[PDB]
Amino acid sequence: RRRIATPEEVRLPLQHGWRREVRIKKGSHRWQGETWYYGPCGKRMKQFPEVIKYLSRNVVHSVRREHFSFSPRMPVGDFFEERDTPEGLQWVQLSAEEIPSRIQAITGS
């Protein structure tokens, strides 16, 4: 990233209306995770080029593209881990304490 964001900046959107969920799933090769975002007044984005367009199309002054980070190593909003249960596959939410443990697996400089 050309501009590195802080968790405080990434929660900045969460303070204004945006939300951010991180989905962590076990891959066939590696541990992976992805960060999702939702417009507080519009559609939902999980790609960087989707966020830049939202800002350009709508009026936003509180949060800029920098406040949005899709790195699953950012322990800001919600973290989930896909798990199997006797009822089926369900996305289990990770606590703040569990977050960094999962990040270590999905981490990638």
UniProtKB/Swiss-Prot annotation:
Domain MBD: 4-75
Mod. after translation: Deacetylation by SIRT1 in late S phase enhances pRNA-binding, allowing de novo DNA methylation and heterochromatin formation. Acetylation is high during S phase and declines to background levels in late S phase when the silent copies of rRNA genes are replicated.
Modified residues (Phosphoserine): 71
Tissue: Expressed at moderate levels in most tissues analyzed, including heart, brain, placenta, lung, skeletal muscle, kidney and pancreas.
Modified residues (Phosphothreonine): 6
Protein localization: Nucleus, Nucleolus
The protein's assembly and partners: Component of the NoRC-1 ISWI chromatin remodeling complex at least composed of SMARCA1 and BAZ2A/TIP5, which regulates the spacing of histone octamers on the DNA template to facilitate access to DNA. Within the NoRC-1 ISWI chromatin remodeling complex interacts with SMARCA1; the interaction is direct. Component of the NoRC-5 ISWI chromatin remodeling complex (also called the NoRC nucleolar-remodeling complex), at least composed of SMARCA5/SNF2H and BAZ2A/TIP5, which regulates the spacing of histone octamers on the DNA template to facilitate access to DNA.
Similarity-based family: Belongs to the WAL family.
Role played: Regulatory subunit of the ATP-dependent NoRC-1 and NoRC-5 ISWI chromatin remodeling complexes, which form ordered nucleosome arrays on chromatin and facilitate access to DNA during DNA-templated processes such as DNA replication, transcription, and repair. Both complexes regulate the spacing of nucleosomes along the chromatin and have the ability to slide mononucleosomes to the center of a DNA template. Directly stimulates the ATPase activity of SMARCA5 in the NoRC-5 ISWI chromatin remodeling complex.
Domain notes: The bromo domain and the PHD-type zinc finger recognize and bind histone H4 acetylated on 'Lys-16' (H4K16ac). These 2 domains play a central role in the recruitment of chromatin silencing proteins such as DNMT1, DNMT3B and HDAC1. The MBD (methyl-CpG-binding) domain, also named TAM domain, specifically recognizes and binds a conserved stem-loop structure the association within pRNA. Binding to pRNA induces a conformational change of BAZ2A/TIP5 and is essential for targeting the NoRC complex to the nucleolus.
Name of the molecule in the record: Bromodomain adjacent to zinc finger domain protein 2A
Lineage of the organism: Eukaryota, Metazoa, Chordata, Craniata, Vertebrata
Included range, full protein: 543 to 650 of 1905
